[PDB]
A paper describes a structure:
We determined a structure of CaMV RT in complex with a hybrid substrate complex at 2.35 Å resolution. The best crystals were obtained in the presence of an RNA/DNA hybrid with a 16 bp double-stranded part and a 2-nucleotide (nt) 5′ overhang in the RNA strand (for the sequence, see Experimental procedures). In the structure, the CaMV RT interacts with the hybrid as a monomer. The POL domain of CaMV RT consists of three subdomains: fingers (residues 36–115 and 150–170), palm (residues 1–35, 116–149, and 171–259), and thumb (residues 260–332). A unique feature of CaMV RT is a short α-helix in the fingers subdomain (residues 91–97) between β strands 2 and 3 (for the labeling of secondary structure elements). It forms interactions with the 3′ end of the DNA primer, which have not been observed in any other RT structure (see below). An important feature of the CaMV RT structure is that α-helix M, which harbors the last residue of the RNase H active site (Asp468), is located further away from the core of the RNase H fold, and this position is stabilized by interactions with the thumb subdomain. This results in the displacement of Asp468 from its canonical position in the RNase H active site, so the conformation of the RNase H domain in our structure corresponds to an inactivated state. The position of the primer end relative to the polymerase active site residues (Asp140, Asp203, and Asp204) is similar between various RTs and the CaMV enzyme, showing that our structure represents a polymerase configuration. RNase H activity requires the transient association of another copy of CaMV RT, which is a new mode of RNase H activity regulation.
Reverse transcriptases (RTs) are enzymes with DNA polymerase and RNase H activities. They convert ssRNA into dsDNA and are key enzymes for the replication of retroviruses and retroelements. Caulimoviruses, which infect plants, are pararetroviruses; they have an open-circular dsDNA genome that upon replication is not integrated into the host genome but instead is maintained in the cell in an episomal form. It uses reverse transcriptase as an essential component of its replication process.
Author numbering: 1 to 312, 314 to 368, 370 to 459, 463 to 475
RNA sequence: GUCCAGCAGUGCGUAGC
DNA sequence: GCTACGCACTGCTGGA
């Protein structure tokens, strides 16, 4: 018996081994393909930032990390006229990685260099590409920027300082403004030919297929592409043949998507009683990652945002009991539908005195159909917009929802459900009101770029949440 | 402390009424 | 007073 499929898996596993390494400059695995150029734009000047002070724990670790970096031959001793300070950072990735991360403050040199015009992808334009796919693999480059060689005139620009002195970089360092663009350009050049089953966000390669069979071919082609170009992957971070893949901070399924669980876990580390305002802004910061997933989250967040104002610190038993509910639903909100390419899309929108809301729905086809929720949007009205009439806030809710969902809606005939009985006449340029003509023509122009019908207006999760809060 | 991205916000200039 | 577009800056989070 053959087991030709297990043979293909071992072949994939060997291609993976062939392109993985812990050294981004690995002499057996790089062709020195990727090169970059960084230009002052006023070459006459010198960019000198005052150094920093270093504690012993940091002066120690620096010594360890600098020997590593010197050993990889990514940095080297420098007598450059430019200098930028290095420091260590300890954020949630570092805490769990077990190692402090070194950062060079390149703000001054970034102000001072010619930009790279090359744009990064939009996260929604990548996600819409994988709608319908069943199987995924994902690959992070090993310290990717460090695989791009800097030419001789550009390396002095990278010179930094640290306890052990004055070094510069032989490769593109993290923290330069051009680096994501330089790397994205290279990944697009290596892999654009496989755009039908592969996309890259800077650093991260995603392979997607609608079944295991295709995937064996798809992954092998990407891995043989890395080998051809000397692109070094990180074995520890390879996600091979997964039904659920982590990508762009999301957990994505054939039919569903949610934030990565390890992100919204940190909500449950906050107390029900916040000590100070600085901790409240830490809390609001992470609560941000639920906006696509909680209906009317702008409102839920407003009571808390108030406390942040300098004008206002007084925590109450209600403040405490508010935290508890908020914490309970900001973890364990249900995953949302990732719509198939051919599924018909609907947006339902609503408005209140101070906020707008909208919700994206898809029509799952069943031989009686079904409407699945894909994404939520919410926000509060600008200063001038609170004086809008109640029909125009409802129209604004339509516009803001489309804007948020525009990557999905733009190429498709979709359906808007609103409570503005005059919205239908308005978009058909049949609207009577001449009072605010310029704003109306502006909206009519903007809405003209979309193709849609209109209906007048089953979200029990949102009904639960509203009940449980007031 | 950089950089990308998420969320909220502040200021400013230019152009039109 | 309004609109627009686009520059500068701030706080927090995620991560490289």
């Amino acid at each position: 018996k053959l087991f030709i499929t297990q043979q293909r898996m071992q072949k994939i596993e060997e291609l993976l081994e062939k392109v993985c390494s812990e050294n981004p400059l690995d002499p057996n695995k790089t062709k020195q393909w990727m090169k970059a150029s960084i230009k002052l734009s006023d070459p006459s000047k010198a960019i000198k930032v005052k150094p920093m002070k270093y504690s012993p724990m940091d002066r120690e670790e620096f010594d360890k990390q600098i020997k590593e970096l010197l050993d990889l031959k990514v940095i080297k001793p420098s007598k450059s006229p430019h200098m930028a300070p290095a420091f260590l950072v300890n954020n949630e990735a570092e805490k769990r990685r077990g190692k402090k991360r070194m950062v060079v403050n390149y703000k001054a040199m970034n102000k001072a260099t010619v930009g790279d015009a090359y744009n990064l992808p939009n996260k929604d334009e990548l996600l819409t590409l994988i709608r319908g796919k069943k199987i995924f693999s994902s690959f992070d480059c090993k310290s990717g920027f460090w695989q791009v060689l800097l030419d001789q005139e550009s390396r002095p620009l990278t010179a930094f300082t640290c306890p052990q002195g004055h070094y510069e970089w032989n490769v593109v360092p993290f923290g330069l403004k051009q680096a994501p663009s330089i790397f994205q350009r290279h990944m697009d050049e290596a892999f654009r030919v496989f755009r039908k089953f592969c996309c890259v966000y800077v650093d991260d390669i995603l392979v997607f297929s609608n079944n295991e069979e295709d995937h064996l071919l798809h992954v092998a082609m990407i891995l043989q592409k890395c080998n051809q170009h000397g692109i070094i992957l990180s074995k520890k971070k390879a996600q091979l043949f997964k039904k659920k893949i982590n990508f762009l901070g999301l957990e994505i399924d054939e039919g569903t998507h949610k934030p990565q669980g390890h992100i919204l876990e940190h909500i449950n580390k906050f107390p029900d009683t916040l000590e100070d305002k600085k901790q409240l802004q830490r809390f609001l910061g992470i609560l941000t990652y639920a906006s696509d997933y909680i209906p009317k989250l702008a409102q839920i967040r407003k009571p808390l945002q108030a406390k942040l104002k300098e004008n206002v610190w007084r925590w109450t038993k209600e403040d405490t009991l508010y935290m508890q509910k908020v914490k309970k639903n900001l973890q364990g909100f249900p995953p949302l539908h990732h719509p198939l390419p051919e599924e018909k899309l609907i947006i339902e929108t609503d408005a209140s005195d101070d906020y707008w809301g909208g919700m994206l729905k898809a029509i799952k086809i069943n031989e009686t159909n079904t409407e699945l929720i894909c994404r939520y949007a919410s926000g509060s009205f600008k200063a001038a917009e609170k004086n809008y009439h109640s029909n125009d806030k409802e129209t604004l809710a339509v516009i803001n929802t489309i804007k948020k969902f525009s990557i999905y809606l733009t190429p498709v005939h979709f359906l808007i459900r609103t409570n503005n009985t005059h919205f239908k006449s308005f978009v058909n340029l049949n609207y009577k009101g001449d009072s605010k003509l310029g704003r109306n023509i502006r909206w009519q122009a903007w809405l003209s770029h979309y193709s849609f019908d209109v209906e007048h207006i089953d979200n029990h999760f949102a009904d639960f949440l509203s009940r449980e809060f007031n």
